[PDB]
């Protein structure tokens, strides 16, 4: 039961997502979040406020935006990338991978420029519109999502940067060619071994630089000698230009990982790239006061951000 609650409000087909039509003939997506109260509990209210403030901060075609601002309204997205990859009947041509990647990276670029790190990018939160174009959601902070975590996150590193999103993006690129996720691990050790088997044994001096003391304790006697595999065997459907980018996105050490601008500028996107995409529709630095926490103090900023009925 969910549709009956909106009969007294305004339409039917983390929270509960359901489809429907708007006041006018527009296909929308309505998310309902109330209990697990959430909007009353100052901790979880701050998390919901963070999502609303983030969605309202951006106004870019590759980032999900609110259509009506607990009930939440956005445009209805046909399907997600996970469903397109995990449905072998639908074929993803290299031309489709190039287009998808260009839009995925543009969305990440928009977040990174505003100082936002997704931290959990996977095909499940890369949504596809009715017009086939890519949109990113769930940038506000199942088992398979741990297959897209950068080595520094697997190693519980506190000083992770926007570069974790590159590794995630690099994982979804190889997944579009292989039609099977790249690093399908079940443990801390086997997830790291699968990564190292493909990328090559990183220097000990580099791992200590991007691991928590406990991750170093787990890996203390865990010394590997594994050589770097040929990328042609790892991702066989990819051409040398696509493999060059994948390898650059999938750098163990984030200090060598290709930046959002550099990947967008790579020859792989030559036929699609326009330098204006790096600057158009960009939001300014996103600021959120995490220090402030109270009952009625949050409900006043809630009505301040919303202007449309």
- The radius of gyration of the chain's CA atoms, rounded to the nearest angstrom, is 21
35-43, 74-82, 147-155, 204-212 -> range binding ligand SB2 (CB under 6 A): 74-82
Site for ligand SB2, residues 152 to 211, rule: CB under 6 A: none
Q: Which of 98, 125, 168, 211 binds ligand SB2 (CB under 6 A)?
A: 125
Q: Which is nearer to ligand SB2, 20 or 94 (CB)?
A: 20
Name residues whose C-beta falls within 8 Å of residue 103's C-beta, 6 or more positions apart in sequence: 62, 133, 134
If one asks whether residue 76 binds ligand SB2 (CB under 6 A), the answer comes out as yes
Instruction: Report the alpha-carbon distance of residue 120 to residue 105 in Å, rounded.
Output: 14
Count of alpha carbons within 13 angstroms of residue 129, beta-carbon side:
15
Part of the chain binding ligand SB2 (CB under 6 A), chosen from 109-117, 137-145, 240-248, 300-308:
137-145
The answer to whether residue 247 forms part of the interface with ligand SB2 (CB under 6 A) is no
> What x/- string results for residues 22 through 61 when contact with ligand SB2 is judged by CB under 6 A?
-------x-x------------------------------
Total residues contacting ligand SB2 (rule CB under 6 A)?
Answer: 14
What is the CB neighbour count within 10 angstroms for residue 214? 11
SS3 category, 21 = strand
CB of 190 to ligand SB2, least distance (A): 23
| Residue 124 engages ligand SB2 in binding (rule: CB under 6 A) | yes
DSSP secondary structure letters along 31-91 = EE-----TTTSHHHHHHHHHHHHHHHH---TTB--EEE--EEEEEPPSEEHHHHHT-TTS-
Nearer to ligand SB2, 64 or 219 (CB): 64
For the CB of residue 54, give the shortest distance to ligand SB2 in the complex, in Å.
10
The residue among 127 and 150 lying less far from ligand SB2, judged by its C-beta, is: 127
Can you name the residues that pair with 173 across neighbouring β-strands?
none
For residue 225, how many other CB atoms are within 10 A of its CB?
A: 5
Using the rule CB under 6 A, which residue among 138, 152, 165, 251 binds ligand SB2? 138
Choosing from 33, 48, 77, 181, the residue that interacts with ligand SB2 (CB under 6 A) is: 77
Contacts of 286 (CB under 8 A, 6+ apart): 53, 54, 57, 114, 115, 116
Alpha-carbon distance of 58 to 56, in angstroms, equals: 6
**235 is a site residue for ligand SB2 (CB under 6 A):** no
Rank residues 125 and 283 by Cβ distance to ligand SB2 and give the closer one: 125
By CB under 6 A, residue 104 contacts ligand SB2 = no
276-305 footprint of ligand SB2 as x/- string (CB under 6 A):
------------------------------
Q: What minimum distance in Å lies between the beta carbon of 1 and ligand SB2? A: 19
Closer CB to ligand SB2, 137 or 246, in the complex? 137
Could you give the residue numbers annotated as active site?
120
- For residues 23-58, one letter each, b for 16 or more C-beta atoms within 10 angstroms of the residue's C-beta and e for the rest, the string is eeeeebbbeebeeeeeeeeeeebbebbebbbbbebb
Helices (H), 114-163: 151-154
List the strands of the sheet with 79-80, edge to edge.
79-80, 126-128, 134-136
Is the Cβ of residue 76 or residue 246 nearer to ligand SB2 in the bound state?
76
Q: Which residues make up the interface to ligand SB2 (CB under 6 A)?
A: 17, 29, 31, 66, 72, 74, 76-77, 124-125, 127, 137-138, 142
């Amino acid at each position: 039961a969910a549709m009956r609650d909106l009969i007294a409000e305004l339409v039917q087909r983390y929270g509960a997502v359901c489809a429907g039509v708007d006041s006018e003939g527009i296909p929308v997506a309505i998310k309902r979040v109330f209990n697990t109260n959430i909007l009353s509990d100052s901790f979880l209210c701050k998390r919901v406020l963070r999502e609303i403030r983030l969605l309202n901060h951006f106004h870019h075609p590759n980032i999900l935006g609110l259509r009506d601002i607990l009930y939440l309204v956005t445009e209805l997205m046909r399907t997600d990338l996970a469903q397109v990859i995990h449905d072998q009947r639908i074929v993803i041509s290299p031309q489709h991978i190039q287009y998808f990647m260009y839009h995925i990276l543009l969305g990440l670029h928009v977040l990174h420029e505003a100082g936002v790190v997704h931290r959990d990018l996977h095909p499940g939160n890369i949504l596809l519109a009715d017009n086939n174009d890519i949109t990113i959601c769930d940038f506000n902070l199942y088992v398979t999502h741990r297959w897209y975590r950068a080595p520094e996150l697997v190693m519980q590193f506190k000083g992770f940067t926007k570069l974790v999103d590159m590794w995630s993006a690099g994982c979804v690129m190889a997944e579009m060619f292989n039609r099977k996720a790249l690093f399908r691990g079940s443990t801390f050790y086997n997830q790291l071994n699968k990564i190292v088997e493909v990328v090559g044994t990183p220097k000990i001096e580099d791992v200590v630089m991007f691991s928590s003391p406990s991750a170093r304790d787990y890996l203390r006697n865990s010394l590997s000698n594994v050589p770097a595999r040929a990328w042609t065997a790892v991702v066989p459907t990819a051409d040398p230009v696509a493999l060059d980018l994948i390898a650059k996105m999938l750098e163990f050490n984030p200090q060598r990982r290709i930046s959002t601008e550099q990947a967008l500028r790579h020859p792989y996107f030559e036929s699609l790239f326009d330098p204006l995409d790096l600057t158009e529709g960009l939001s300014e630095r996103f600021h959120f006061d995490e220090s402030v926490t109270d009952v009625y103090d949050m409900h006043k900023i809630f009505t301040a951000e919303v202007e449309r009925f």
